Amino acid sequence: GRVLDRIEVVAEEIRGQAVQSEADCRLTDAAAGLLRDSGAIRLLQPRLYGGYEVHPREFAETVMGVAALDGASGWVTGIVGVHPWELAFADPQVQEEIWGEDNDTWMASPYAPMGVATPVDGGYVLKGRWSFSSGTDHCQWAFLGAMVGDATPSSLHVILPRTDYQIVEDTWDVIGLRGTGSKDLIVDGAFVPGYRTLNAAKVMDGRAQKEAGRPEPLFNMPYSCMFPLGITAAVIGITEGALACHIAVQKDRVAITGQKIKEDPYVLSAIGESAAEINASRVSLIETADRFYDKVDAGKEITFEERAIGRRTQIAAAWRAVRAADEIFARAGGGALHYKTPMQRFWRDAHAGLAHAVHVPGPTNHASALTQLGGEPQGMMRAMI
Numbered sequence: 135g136r137v138l139d140r141i142e143v144v145a146e147e148i149r150g151q152a153v154q155s156e157a158d159c160r161l162t163d164a165a166a167g168l169l170r171d172s173g174a175i176r177l178l179q180p181r182l183y184g185g186y187e188v189h190p191r192e193f194a195e196t197v198m199g200v201a202a203l204d205g206a207s208g209w210v211t212g213i214v215g216v217h218p219w220e221l222a223f224a225d226p227q228v229q230e231e232i233w234g235e236d237n238d239t240w241m242a243s244p245y246a247p248m249g250v251a252t253p254v255d256g257g258y259v260l261k262g263r264w265s266f267s268s269g270t271d272h273c274q275w276a277f278l279g280a281m282v283g284d285a286t287p288s289s290l291h292v293i294l295p296r297t298d299y300q301i302v303e304d305t306w307d308v309i310g311l312r313g314t315g316s317k318d319l320i321v322d323g324a325f326v327p328g329y330r331t332l333n334a335a336k337v338m339d340g341r342a343q344k345e346a347g348r349p350e351p352l353f354n355m356p357y358s359c360m361f362p363l364g365i366t367a368a369v370i371g372i373t374e375g376a377l378a379c380h381i382a383v384q385k386d387r388v389a390i391t392g393q394k395i396k397e398d399p400y401v402l403s404a405i406g407e408s409a410a411e412i413n414a415s416r417v418s419l420i421e422t423a424d425r426f427y428d429k430v431d432a433g434k435e436i437t438f439e440e441r442a443i444g445r446r447t448q449i450a451a452a453w454r455a456v457r458a459a460d461e462i463f464a465r466a467g468g469g470a471l472h473y474k475t476p477m478q479r480f481w482r483d484a485h486a487g488l489a490h491a492v493h494v495p496g497p498t499n500h501a502s503a504l505t506q507l508g509g510e511p512q513g514m515m516r517a518m519i
Contacts, residue, residue, distance in 0.1 A: 160315030184237030201371025205483030206313030212364030247279035310486030
């Protein structure tokens, strides 16, 4: 696809901004510019608003490609890049507000329901504090989760202009993905009109998409597939970056003892093992999306069990890839501990990415297995499927 070709062209420029975005804990303007100009955030955007409506496979592969160059950029592409997908089935009025003048206007996250929306006439009033708002300095709107206080939805996704919230400085001093600048946001009491909200349960279960009735199969994909897809793709591509870094170093490396690493059977076979695991994650994650897309294109319904199994695969894919990156980092030696070498940055980024809520494994493994035994997950055990 064309976006990935444009990324390949500026690959050296992207790698060129990485150290500085990390030092700043925020993508440099040049780093954000490289992504904005490449069209990466428009991957899943409606064509009406300059977007490409790519197949999920293309989105996933592009994120992985960006992530292998600079983990922070890759991560921001996979998160900020998913927001146009959901907005596609938000009220036409908010899509016009966000993209009407400038198609390249970005939305920040998180969807975590960290806020409280008080229903008032015409909409809601919002108060809360959210964390992990990736790429937020470069966004002009936020898409946030909220619970509804005291005939309305129980939970919402709400859209706010940057004018209506505060980015909290010094709230992203973390071990990895430093360059994402995933700062806290605070809202003291912002009015949010009804047309700038979606009911979160309807987003999850397909009812918001049915109400919008779009013809494009892309926009009828399950939320539980699409939202975690960018995030786990970023983790996968980060580990592919680490592997690439490791290989580049190992080719010339002569070890503490006198031994050339390119002649070391223990280290070389362990590289093969890790590369096999990381590939298994890439293919697995993408296969779910291919198949879901095929069913949606065919007008066939994606079942709860199918969704649950897809989440299971996606979670397992993140974990497999991170563990594989750990195995090669442990064999990279003491020189790989230094900040002046890139591998360690990919390695820490992968671990930061693994801490995201979409990677918690236990409940989903349990719930998907329960559906396979003929049982029905109840209540909270149905969340994020």
